[PDB]
Short mmCIF file of C-alpha atoms in Angstrom, two decimals:
data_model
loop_
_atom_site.label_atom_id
_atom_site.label_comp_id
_atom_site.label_asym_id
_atom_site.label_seq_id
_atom_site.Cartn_x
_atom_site.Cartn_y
_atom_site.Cartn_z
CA UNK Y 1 -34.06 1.23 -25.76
CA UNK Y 2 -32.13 1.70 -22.57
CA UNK Y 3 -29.89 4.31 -21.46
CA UNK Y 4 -27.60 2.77 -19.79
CA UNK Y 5 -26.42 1.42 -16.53
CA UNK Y 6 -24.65 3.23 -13.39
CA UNK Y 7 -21.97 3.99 -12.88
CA UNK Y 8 -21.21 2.74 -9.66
CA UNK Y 9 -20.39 5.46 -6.86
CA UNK Y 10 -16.96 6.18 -5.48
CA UNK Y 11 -17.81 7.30 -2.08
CA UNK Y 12 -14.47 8.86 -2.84
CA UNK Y 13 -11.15 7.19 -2.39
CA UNK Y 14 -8.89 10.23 -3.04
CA UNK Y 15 -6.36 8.10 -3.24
CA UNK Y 16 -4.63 5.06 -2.76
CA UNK Y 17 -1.84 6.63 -1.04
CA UNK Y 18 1.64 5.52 -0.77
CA UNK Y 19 2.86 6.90 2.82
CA UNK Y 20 1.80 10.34 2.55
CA UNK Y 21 -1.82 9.55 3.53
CA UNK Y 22 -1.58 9.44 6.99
CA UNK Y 23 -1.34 12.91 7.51
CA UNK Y 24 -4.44 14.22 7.08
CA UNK Y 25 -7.51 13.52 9.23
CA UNK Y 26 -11.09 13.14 7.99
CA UNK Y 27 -13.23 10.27 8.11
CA UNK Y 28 -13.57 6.46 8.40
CA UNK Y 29 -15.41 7.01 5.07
CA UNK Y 30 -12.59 7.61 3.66
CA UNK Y 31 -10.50 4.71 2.65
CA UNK Y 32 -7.18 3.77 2.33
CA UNK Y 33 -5.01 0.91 0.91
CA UNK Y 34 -1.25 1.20 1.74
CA UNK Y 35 1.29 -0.56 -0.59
CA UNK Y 36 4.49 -1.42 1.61
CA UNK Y 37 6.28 -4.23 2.59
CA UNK Y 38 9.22 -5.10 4.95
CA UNK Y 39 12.55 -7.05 3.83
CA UNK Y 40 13.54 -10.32 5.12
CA UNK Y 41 14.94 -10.11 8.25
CA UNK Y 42 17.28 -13.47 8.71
CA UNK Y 43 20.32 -12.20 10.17
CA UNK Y 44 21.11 -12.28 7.10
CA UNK Y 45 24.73 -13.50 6.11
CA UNK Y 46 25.21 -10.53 3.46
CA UNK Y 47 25.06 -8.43 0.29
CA UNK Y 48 24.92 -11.77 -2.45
CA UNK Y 49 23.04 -13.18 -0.16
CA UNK Y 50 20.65 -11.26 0.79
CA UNK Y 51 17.28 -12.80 1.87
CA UNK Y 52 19.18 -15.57 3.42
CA UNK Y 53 20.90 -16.65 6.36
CA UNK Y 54 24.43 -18.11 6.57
CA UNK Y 55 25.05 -21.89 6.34
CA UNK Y 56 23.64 -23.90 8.82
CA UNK Y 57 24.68 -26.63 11.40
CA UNK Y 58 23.27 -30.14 12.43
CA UNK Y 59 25.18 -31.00 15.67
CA UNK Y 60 26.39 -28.86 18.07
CA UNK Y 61 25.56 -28.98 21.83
CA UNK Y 62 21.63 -29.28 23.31
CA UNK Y 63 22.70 -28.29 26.10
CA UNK Y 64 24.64 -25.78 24.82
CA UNK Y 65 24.77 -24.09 21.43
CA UNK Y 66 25.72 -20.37 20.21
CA UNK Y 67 25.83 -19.28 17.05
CA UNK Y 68 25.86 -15.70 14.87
CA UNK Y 69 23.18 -14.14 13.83
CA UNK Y 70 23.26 -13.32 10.05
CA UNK Y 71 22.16 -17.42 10.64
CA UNK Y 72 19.23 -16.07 12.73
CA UNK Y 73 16.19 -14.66 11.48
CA UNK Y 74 14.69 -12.27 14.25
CA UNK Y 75 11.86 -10.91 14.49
CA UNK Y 76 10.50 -8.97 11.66
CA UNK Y 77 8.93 -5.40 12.72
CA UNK Y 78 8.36 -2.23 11.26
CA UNK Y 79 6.34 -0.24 13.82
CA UNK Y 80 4.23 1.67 11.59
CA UNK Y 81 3.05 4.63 13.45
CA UNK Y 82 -0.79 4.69 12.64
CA UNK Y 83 -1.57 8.14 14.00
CA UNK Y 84 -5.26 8.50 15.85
CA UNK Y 85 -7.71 10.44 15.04
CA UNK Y 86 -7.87 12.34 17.49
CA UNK Y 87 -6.53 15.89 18.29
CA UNK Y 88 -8.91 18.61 20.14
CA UNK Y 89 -10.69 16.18 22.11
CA UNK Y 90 -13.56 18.86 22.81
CA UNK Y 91 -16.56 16.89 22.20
CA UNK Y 92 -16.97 13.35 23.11
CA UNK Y 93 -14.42 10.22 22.37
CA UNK Y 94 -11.36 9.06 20.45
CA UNK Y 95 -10.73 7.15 17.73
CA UNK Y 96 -8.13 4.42 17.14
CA UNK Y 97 -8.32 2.28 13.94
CA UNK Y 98 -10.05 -0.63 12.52
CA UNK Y 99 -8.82 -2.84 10.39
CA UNK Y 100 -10.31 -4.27 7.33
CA UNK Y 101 -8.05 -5.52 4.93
CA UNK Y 102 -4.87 -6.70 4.51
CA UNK Y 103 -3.09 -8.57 1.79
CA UNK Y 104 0.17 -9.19 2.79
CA UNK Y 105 2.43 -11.86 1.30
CA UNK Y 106 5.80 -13.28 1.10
CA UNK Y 107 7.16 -11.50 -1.30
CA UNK Y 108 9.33 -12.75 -3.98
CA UNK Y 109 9.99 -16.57 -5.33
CA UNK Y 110 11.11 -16.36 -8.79
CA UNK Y 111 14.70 -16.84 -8.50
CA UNK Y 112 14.56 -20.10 -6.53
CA UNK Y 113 12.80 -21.53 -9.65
CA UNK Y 114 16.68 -21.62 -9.98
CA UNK Y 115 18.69 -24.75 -9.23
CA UNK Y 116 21.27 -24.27 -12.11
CA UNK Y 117 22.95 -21.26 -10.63
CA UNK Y 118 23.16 -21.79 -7.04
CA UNK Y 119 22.27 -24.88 -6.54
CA UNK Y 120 23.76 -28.06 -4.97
CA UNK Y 121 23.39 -30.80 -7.52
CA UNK Y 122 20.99 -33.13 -6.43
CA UNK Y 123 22.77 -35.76 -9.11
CA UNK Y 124 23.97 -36.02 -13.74
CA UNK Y 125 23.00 -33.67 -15.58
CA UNK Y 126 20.24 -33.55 -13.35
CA UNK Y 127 20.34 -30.04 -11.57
CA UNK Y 128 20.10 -28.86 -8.00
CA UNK Y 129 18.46 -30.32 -5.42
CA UNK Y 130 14.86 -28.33 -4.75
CA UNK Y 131 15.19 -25.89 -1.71
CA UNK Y 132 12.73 -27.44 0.41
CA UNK Y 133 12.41 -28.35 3.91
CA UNK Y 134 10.59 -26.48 6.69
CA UNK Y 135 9.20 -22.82 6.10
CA UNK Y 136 7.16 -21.08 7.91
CA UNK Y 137 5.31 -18.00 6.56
CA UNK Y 138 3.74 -15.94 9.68
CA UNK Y 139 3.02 -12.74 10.30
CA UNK Y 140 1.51 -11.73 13.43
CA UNK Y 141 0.17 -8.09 13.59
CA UNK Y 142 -1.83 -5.99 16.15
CA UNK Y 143 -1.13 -2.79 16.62
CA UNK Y 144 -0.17 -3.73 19.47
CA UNK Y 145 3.64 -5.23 19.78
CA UNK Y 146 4.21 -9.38 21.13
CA UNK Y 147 3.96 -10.48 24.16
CA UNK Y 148 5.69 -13.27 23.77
CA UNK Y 149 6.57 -16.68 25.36
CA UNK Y 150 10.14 -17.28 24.57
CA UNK Y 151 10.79 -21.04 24.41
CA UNK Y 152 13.79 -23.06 24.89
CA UNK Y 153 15.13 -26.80 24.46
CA UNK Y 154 18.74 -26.39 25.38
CA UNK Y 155 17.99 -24.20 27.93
CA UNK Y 156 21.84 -24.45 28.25
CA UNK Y 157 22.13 -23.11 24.84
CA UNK Y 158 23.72 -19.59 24.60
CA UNK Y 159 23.10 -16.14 22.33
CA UNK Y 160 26.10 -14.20 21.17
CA UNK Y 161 24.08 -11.11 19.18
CA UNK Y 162 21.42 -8.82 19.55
CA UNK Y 163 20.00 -12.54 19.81
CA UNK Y 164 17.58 -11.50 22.82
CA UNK Y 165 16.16 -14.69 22.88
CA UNK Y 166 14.10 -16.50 25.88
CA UNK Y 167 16.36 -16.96 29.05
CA UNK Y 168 15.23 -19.38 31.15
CA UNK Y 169 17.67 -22.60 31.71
CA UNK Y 170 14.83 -24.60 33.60
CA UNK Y 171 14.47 -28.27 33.16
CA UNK Y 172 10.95 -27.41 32.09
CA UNK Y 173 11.87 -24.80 29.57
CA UNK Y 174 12.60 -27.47 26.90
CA UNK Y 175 8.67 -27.49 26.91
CA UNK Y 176 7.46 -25.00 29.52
CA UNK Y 177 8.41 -21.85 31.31
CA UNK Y 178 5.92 -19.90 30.98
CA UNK Y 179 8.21 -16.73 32.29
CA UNK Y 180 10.13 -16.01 28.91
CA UNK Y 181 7.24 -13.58 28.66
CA UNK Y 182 8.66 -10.84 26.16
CA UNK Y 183 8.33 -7.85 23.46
CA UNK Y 184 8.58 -7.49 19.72
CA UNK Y 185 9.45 -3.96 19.62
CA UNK Y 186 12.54 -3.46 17.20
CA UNK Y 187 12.93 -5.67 13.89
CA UNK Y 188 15.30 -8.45 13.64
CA UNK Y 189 16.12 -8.84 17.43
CA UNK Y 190 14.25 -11.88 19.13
CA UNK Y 191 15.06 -14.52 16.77
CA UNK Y 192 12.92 -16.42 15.32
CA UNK Y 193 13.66 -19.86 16.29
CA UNK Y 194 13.23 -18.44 20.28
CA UNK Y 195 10.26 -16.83 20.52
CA UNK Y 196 6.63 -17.75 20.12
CA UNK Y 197 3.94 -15.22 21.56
CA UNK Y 198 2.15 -15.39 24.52
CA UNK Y 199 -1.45 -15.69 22.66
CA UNK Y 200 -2.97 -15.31 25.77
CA UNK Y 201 -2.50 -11.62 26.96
CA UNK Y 202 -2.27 -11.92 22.84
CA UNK Y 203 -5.60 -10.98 22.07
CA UNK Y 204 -5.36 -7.51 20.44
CA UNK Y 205 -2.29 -8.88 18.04
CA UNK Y 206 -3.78 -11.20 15.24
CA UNK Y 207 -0.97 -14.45 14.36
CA UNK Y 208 -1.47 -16.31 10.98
CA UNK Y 209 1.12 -18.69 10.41
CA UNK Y 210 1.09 -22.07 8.96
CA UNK Y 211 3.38 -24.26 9.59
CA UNK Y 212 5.11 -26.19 6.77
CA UNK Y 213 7.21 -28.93 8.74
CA UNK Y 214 9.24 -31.69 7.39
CA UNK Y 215 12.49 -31.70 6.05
CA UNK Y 216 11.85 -31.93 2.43
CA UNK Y 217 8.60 -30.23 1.92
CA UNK Y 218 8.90 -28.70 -1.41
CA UNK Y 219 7.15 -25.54 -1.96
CA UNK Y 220 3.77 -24.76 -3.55
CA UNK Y 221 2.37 -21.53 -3.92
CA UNK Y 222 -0.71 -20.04 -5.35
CA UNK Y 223 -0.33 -17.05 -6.74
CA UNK Y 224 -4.34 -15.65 -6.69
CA UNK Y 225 -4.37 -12.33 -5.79
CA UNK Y 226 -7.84 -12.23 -5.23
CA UNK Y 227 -7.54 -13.66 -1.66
CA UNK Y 228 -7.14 -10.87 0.51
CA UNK Y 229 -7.98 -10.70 4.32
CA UNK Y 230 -10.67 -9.22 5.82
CA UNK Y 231 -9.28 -8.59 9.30
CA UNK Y 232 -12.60 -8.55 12.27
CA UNK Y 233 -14.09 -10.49 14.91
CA UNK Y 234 -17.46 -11.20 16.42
CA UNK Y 235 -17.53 -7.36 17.98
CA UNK Y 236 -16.29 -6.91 14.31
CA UNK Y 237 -12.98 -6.25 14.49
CA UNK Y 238 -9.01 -7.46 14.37
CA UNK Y 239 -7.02 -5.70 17.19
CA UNK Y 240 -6.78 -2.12 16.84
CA UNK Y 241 -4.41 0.06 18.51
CA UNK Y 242 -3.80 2.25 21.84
CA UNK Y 243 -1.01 2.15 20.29
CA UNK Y 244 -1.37 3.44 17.36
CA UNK Y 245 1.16 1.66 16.15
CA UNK Y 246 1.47 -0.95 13.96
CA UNK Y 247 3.49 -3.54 15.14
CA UNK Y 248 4.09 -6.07 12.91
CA UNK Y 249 5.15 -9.19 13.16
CA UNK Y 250 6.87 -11.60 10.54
CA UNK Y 251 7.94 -14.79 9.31
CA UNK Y 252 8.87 -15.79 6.04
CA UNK Y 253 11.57 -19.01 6.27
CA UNK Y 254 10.83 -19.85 3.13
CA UNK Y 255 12.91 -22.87 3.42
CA UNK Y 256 16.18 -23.60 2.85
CA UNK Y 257 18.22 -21.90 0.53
CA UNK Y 258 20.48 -25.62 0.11
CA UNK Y 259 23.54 -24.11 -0.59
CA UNK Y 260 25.65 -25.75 -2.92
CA UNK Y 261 27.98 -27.28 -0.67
CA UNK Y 262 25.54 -29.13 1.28
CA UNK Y 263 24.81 -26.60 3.96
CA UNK Y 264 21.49 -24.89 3.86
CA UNK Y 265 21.29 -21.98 4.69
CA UNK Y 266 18.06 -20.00 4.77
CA UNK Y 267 16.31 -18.92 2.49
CA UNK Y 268 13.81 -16.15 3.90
CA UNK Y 269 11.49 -13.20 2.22
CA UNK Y 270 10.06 -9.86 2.17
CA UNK Y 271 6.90 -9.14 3.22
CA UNK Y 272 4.36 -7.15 1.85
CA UNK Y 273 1.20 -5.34 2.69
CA UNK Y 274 -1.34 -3.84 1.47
CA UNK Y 275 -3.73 -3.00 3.73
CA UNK Y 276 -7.32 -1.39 4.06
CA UNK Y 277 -7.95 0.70 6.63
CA UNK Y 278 -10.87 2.79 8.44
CA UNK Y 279 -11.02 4.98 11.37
CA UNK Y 280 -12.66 3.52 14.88
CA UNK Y 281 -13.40 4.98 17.83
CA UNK Y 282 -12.80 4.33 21.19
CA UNK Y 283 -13.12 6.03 24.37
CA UNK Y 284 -11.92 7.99 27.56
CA UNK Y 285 -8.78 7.08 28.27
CA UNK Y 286 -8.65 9.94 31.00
CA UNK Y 287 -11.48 11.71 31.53
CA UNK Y 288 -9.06 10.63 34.89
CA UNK Y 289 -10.05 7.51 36.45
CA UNK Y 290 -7.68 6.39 39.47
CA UNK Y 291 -6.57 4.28 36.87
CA UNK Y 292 -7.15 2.48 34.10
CA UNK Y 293 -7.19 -1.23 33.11
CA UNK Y 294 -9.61 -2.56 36.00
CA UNK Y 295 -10.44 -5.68 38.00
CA UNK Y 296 -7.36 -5.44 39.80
CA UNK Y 297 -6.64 -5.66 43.38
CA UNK Y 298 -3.12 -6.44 43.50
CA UNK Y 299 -0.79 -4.09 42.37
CA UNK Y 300 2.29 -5.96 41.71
CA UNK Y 301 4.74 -4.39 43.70
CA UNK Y 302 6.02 -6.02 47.02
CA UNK Y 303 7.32 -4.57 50.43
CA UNK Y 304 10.45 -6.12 52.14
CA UNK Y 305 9.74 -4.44 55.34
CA UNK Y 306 10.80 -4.33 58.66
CA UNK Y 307 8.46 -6.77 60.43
CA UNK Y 308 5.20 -6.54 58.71
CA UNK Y 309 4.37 -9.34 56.19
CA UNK Y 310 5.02 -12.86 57.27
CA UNK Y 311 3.54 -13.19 60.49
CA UNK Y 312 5.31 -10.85 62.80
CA UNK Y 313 4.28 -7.35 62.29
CA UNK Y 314 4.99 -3.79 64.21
CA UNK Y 315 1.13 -3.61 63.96
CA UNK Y 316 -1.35 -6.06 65.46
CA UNK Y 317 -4.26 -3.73 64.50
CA UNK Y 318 -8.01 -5.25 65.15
CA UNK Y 319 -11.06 -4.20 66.93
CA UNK Y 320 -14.50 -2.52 65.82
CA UNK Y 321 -13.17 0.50 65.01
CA UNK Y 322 -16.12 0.46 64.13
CA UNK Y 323 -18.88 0.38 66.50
CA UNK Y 324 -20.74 3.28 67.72
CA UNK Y 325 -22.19 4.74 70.75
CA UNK Y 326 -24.51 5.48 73.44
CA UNK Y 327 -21.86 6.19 76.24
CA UNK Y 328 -20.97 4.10 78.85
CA UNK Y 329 -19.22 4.55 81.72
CA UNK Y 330 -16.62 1.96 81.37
CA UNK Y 331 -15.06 2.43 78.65
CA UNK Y 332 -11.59 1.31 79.15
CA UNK Y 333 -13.86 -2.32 78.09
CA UNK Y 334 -12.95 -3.42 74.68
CA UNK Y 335 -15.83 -4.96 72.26
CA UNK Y 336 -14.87 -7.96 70.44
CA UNK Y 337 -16.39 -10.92 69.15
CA UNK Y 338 -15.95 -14.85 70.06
CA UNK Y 339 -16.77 -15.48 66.12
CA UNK Y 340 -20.58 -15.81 66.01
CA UNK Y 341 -20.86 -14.70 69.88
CA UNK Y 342 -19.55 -11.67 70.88
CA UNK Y 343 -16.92 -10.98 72.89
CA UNK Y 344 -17.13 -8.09 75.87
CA UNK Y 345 -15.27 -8.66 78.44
CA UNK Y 346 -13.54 -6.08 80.19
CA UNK Y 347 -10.49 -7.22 78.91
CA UNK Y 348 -11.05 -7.79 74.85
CA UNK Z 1 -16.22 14.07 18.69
CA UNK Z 2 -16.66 10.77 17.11
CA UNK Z 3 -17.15 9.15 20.19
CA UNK Z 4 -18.75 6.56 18.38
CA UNK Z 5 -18.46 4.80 21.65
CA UNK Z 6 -17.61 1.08 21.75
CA UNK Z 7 -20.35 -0.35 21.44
CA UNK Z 8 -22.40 -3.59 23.28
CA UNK Z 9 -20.80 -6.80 24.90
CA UNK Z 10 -21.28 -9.07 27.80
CA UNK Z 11 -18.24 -7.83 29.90
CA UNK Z 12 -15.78 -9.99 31.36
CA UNK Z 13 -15.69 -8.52 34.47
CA UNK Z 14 -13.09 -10.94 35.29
CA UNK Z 15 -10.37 -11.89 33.57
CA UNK Z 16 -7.38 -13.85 35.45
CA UNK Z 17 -6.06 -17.19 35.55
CA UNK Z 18 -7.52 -18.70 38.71
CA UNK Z 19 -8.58 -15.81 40.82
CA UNK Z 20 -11.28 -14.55 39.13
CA UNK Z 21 -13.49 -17.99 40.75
CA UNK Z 22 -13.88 -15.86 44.10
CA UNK Z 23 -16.66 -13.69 44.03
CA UNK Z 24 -20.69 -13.59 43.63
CA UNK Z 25 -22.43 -12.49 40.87
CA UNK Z 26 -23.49 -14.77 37.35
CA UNK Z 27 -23.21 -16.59 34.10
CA UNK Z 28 -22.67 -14.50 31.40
CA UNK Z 29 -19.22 -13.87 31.77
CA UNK Z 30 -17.43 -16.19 30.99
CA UNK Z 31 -14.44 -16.96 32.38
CA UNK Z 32 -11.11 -17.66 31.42
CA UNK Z 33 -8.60 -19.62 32.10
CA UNK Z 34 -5.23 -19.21 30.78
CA UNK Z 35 -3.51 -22.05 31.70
CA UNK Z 36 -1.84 -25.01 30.31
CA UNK Z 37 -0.09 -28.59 30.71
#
């Protein structure tokens, strides 16, 4: 015979929140999955068509183009305040935290399995032409906000909106100005087709993104659930946050929504997320410490004086300062030094 | 607390771009260089 089996353990999971969960504090034992999602964020051109831009243009100036927003996808945030841990500090170190799961996703194809009540006819009876064409599902996340690179062909080319794009008209900029350094830090502003990140200071902000070029490419989609992320590193972990924020970062052009004229327009998506979460700590943020973030011997921060700088100061300050003594009798002598050799004279 | 404390790595002392090159000390660092064509 055999009694059976376990029952595996729940180290407890109270729940599987919804929001609420944040607001208590407890351990990193404790587990929590969060069910959520952002909308589409593409400018959008309405109400009918929402998840979509408006109608889109071929041929307009490179060295000079502006056009309206609900055309422009921007940035896609929700800041999602992710609360410490920490509270009465009385004993030791903080906690920020880390990061283990995350399925996210593009959120919802079905209806452009349509083509028959949309669509532009693509020819007879034949139906619409298959929304395809360039998409790009992203999502960057830390919980820390982009530092971005803004980029810009058509450095000529202009922003009406909230269309806080990249501003650099350099000849370079078309492939390199490195100085539209920016910040995803309100959804839908920077559009999308301006900004890129920084990666580089981008270390603590995680980007996923893959690329789906060419103008026809025709969708595909593989609808496993069981596929989820598992969000570390080598010191095991994804970013984290001292900022204990989520900032969260977004692409879904899922192609083109080819409206039926023949204009495109976009078609975008919602994302979603369900992430898994666990409390990690971190350290001493002040316990003071002149300052914080350290290796740095240049503060920033430049002088326009009155002659100091270039070459032409109101000081001309040099000498041991630093010598000691015995006591002499001259002292009115100055002490110096040739380079290797020493200089004394009387003089300097 | 749960001062867990971060734990073990071999610090970069010395992040940067190019200025991090100038001063003595050893390998285990590494080094890095932002930087680009």
């Amino acid at each position: 015979p055999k009694k059976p089996k376990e029952p595996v353990q729940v180290p407890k999971l109270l729940i599987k929140g919804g929001v609420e969960v944040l607001e208590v504090k407890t351990g990193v034992d404790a587990i929590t999955e969060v069910e959520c999602f952002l909308n589409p964020e593409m400018g959008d051109p309405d109400e009918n068509l929402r998840g979509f831009s408006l109608k889109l243009s071929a041929e307009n100036d490179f060295s000079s183009d502006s056009p309206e927003r609900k055309m422009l996808p921007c940035y896609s945030t929700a800041r999602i305040p992710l609360p410490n841990l920490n509270e009465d500090l009385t004993c030791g170190n903080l906690l920020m935290w880390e990061a283990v799961t995350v399925q996210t996703e593009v959120i919802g194809i079905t209806s452009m399995l349509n083509l028959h009540a949309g669509s532009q006819k693509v020819h007879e009876h034949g139906g619409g032409k298959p929304i395809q064409g360039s998409n790009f599902h992203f999502f960057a996340v830390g919980g820390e906000p982009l530092e971005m690179q803004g980029v810009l062909m058509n450095y000529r080319s202009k922003y009406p909106d909230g269309t806080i794009t990249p501003k650099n008209p350099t000849a370079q900029s078309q492939v390199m100005n490195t100085d539209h350094k920016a910040y995803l830090d309100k959804n839908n502003a920077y559009p999308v087709e301006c900004w890129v990140p920084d990666p580089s200071r981008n270390e603590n902000a995680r980007y996923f993104g893959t690329f789906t070029g060419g103008e026809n490419v025709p969708p595909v989609l593989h609808v496993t659930n069981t596929a989820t992320t598992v969000l570390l590193d080598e010191q095991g972990v994804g970013p984290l946050c001292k900022a204990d924020s989520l900032y969260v970062s977004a692409a879904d052009i899922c192609g083109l929504f080819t409206n039926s004229s023949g204009t495109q327009q976009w078609r975008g998506l919602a994302r979603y997320f369900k992430i898994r979460l666990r409390k990690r700590s971190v350290k001493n943020p002040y316990p003071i410490s002149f300052l914080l973030s350290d290796l740095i011997n240049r503060r920033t921060q430049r002088v326009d004086g009155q002659p100091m700088y270039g070459m032409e100061s109101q000081v001309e300050e040099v000498r041991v300062f630093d010598g000691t003594e015995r006591l002499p009798g001259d002292p009115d002598m100055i002490r110096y030094i040739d380079k290797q050799g020493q200089l004394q004279t009387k003089m300097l």
